[PDB]
Amino acid sequence: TTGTESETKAFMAVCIETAKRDYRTPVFIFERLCSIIYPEENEVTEFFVTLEKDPQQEDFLQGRMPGNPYSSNEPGIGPLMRDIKNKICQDCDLVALLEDDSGMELLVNNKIISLDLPVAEVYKKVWCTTNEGEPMRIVYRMRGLLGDATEEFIESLDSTTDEEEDEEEVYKMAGVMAQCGGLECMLNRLAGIRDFKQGRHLLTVLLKLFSYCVKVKVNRQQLVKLEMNTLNVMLGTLNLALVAEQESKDSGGAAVAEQVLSIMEIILDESNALTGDKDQLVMLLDQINSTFVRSNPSVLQGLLRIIPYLSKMQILVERFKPYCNFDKYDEDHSGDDKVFLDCFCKIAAGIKNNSNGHQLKDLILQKGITQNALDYMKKHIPSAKNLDADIWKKFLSRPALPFILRLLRGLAIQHPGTQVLIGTDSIPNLHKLEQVSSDEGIGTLAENLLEALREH
């Protein structure tokens, strides 16, 4: 296996053909593929540490650590330097320092190490730079006992420079991998997997490999090709994961679904810089409202990010229309009433500008959702010249007001119909609101709606 990335990719092509000739046989192949594209730093499997007193504090610190050298696998030797501090305080009966993280300092190579740092990283990045293969000597002392610390403090093992690594170059192999055409058979395997339980392991490795492939522009541009049919395969995988997590909680379905959402969103953003049938959007809608997706915010948030790109329409309308009762929303509304209204505003804002998107906006307008919003606004907006009057402040504090403004702005953008409907008798009201700075930001929201209208 050890060889050039080109030889590796040729070996991967061999693996693909062997897989084509079963959700466990090809797993090692994609594992090695990820290893080549992004070699995970070898976790230091086992190392030893010595826990020693500061020789200058020998008479002040009670007890001694008797177990030197300690294995990194020993209880209390990590994962953080704090766990070592706590082990020292416990084994030496230093109970007063156990609750005080500022009372004890740990030194490695005459540097004070932050208690928040991982012991394995301190070993690798601080100790192994000078003492590779020796037990890491950790000196412990009480802070301030001998005066102010003069040693260098290591707060972060990672470089202080905030320089961002070039994902394109970091995963460059994946981009050059496109030449072998793995992306195609990667999608084929994502599809081939019909049993989530048995395919879970293959599915996780394929999605890990996809997360690396989408870092590189050449792979994103290849996956955007309708020939790959990436969208359909990804949607199917997501639905499989959702059903698995619904049938069996903690089956890995949720995590796989979130990964699928992220990859799909990345590919769609690359395409804008994959359009499918609207049935996928209706499936996504049913899912968000499934108890599992509602309970999982990550999955819900990922789903709500891809929904705009996929933009059946009547189904979406009947799903959100009920939550457009702004008058009742002010009277009383549930958390879902709020969540649904926010999601509908987001969908309106993200509606893609095209024939289909225009038709969706026109249908929302015909449903009177915009007309209902305008009527609510006219029924409650005050006419007082002072915009800071108690009446005006009360009208601003209305819970539905912000949601209404957001939805109107989203629908008005790139949609003449909504613009004219609101542009009639409502511009003055919106102008007044924009002049009223409020905690809900009604002024800002109204001004943004007016700017979206300026499109007409």
For residue 108, give the nearest of 157, 59, 60, 146 by alpha carbon: 157
User: Distance between CA atoms of 409 and 377, rounded to whole angstroms?
Assistant: 14
Q: How many residues does the chain have?
A: 456
For residue 110, give the nearest of 61, 50, 83, 150 by alpha carbon: 150
The pair of structure tokens assigned to 295 is 């309970």
The pair of structure tokens assigned to 255 is 């995590």
User: Distance between CA atoms of 205 and 121, rounded to whole angstroms?
Assistant: 26
**Alpha-carbon distances of 30 from 1, 176, 329, rounded to whole Å:** 13, 16, 51
* Burial bucket for residue 256 (CB in 10 Å: 0-12, 13-18, 19+): buried
Tokens 């899912």 correspond to: 287
- 3-state DSSP call for residue 53? strand
Where would I find the H helices in 214-296? 217-223, 230-247, 253-272, 279-289, 291-295
Say how many C-beta atoms besides its own lie within 10 A of residue 59's C-beta.
7
Say how many C-beta atoms besides its own lie within 10 A of residue 238's C-beta.
27
For residue 265, give the nearest of 208, 218, 304 by alpha carbon: 304
DSSP per position, 253-276:
HHHHHHHHHHHHHHHHHHHH----
Resolution attained, angstroms: 3.4
Contact, 393 vs 346, CB < 8 A?
Answer: no
User: Distance between CA atoms of 330 and 419, rounded to whole angstroms?
Assistant: 25
Q: Which amino acid is at 30?
A: F
User: Distance between CA atoms of 50 and 68, rounded to whole angstroms?
Assistant: 5
Say how many C-beta atoms besides its own lie within 10 A of residue 321's C-beta.
17
The pair of structure tokens assigned to 307 is 């929904």
The pair of structure tokens assigned to 227 is 């020939």
User: Distance between CA atoms of 32 and 14, rounded to whole angstroms?
Assistant: 13
Strand order of the β-sheet with 104-108 is 70-71, 48-53, 136-142, 104-108, 111-113, 153-154
Cα angle vertex 441, ends 439, 446, to 5°?
Answer: 150
Cα angle vertex 58, ends 53, 62, to 5°?
Answer: 85
Contact, 442 vs 401, CB < 8 A?
Answer: yes
Tokens 């707060």 correspond to: 155
DSSP per position, 79-127:
SBHHHHHHHHHHHTT-HHHHS-TTSEEEEETTEEEPTTSBHHHHIIIII
DSSP per position, 179-202:
TTTHHHHHHHHHHH---HHHHHHH
Tokens 């505003």 correspond to: 345
Q: Chain-centre distance of CA 44, in angstroms?
A: 28
The pair of structure tokens assigned to 193 is 């997997």
Tokens 């190392």 correspond to: 47
User: Distance between CA atoms of 238 and 255, rounded to whole angstroms?
Assistant: 10
Helix pair angle (400-412, 369-380), 10° resolution: 130
- Each residue of 405-431: b (16+ CB within 10 Å) or e? bbbbbbbbbbbebbbebbbeebeebbe
User: Distance between CA atoms of 159 and 157, rounded to whole angstroms?
Assistant: 7
The pair of structure tokens assigned to 94 is 């230093």
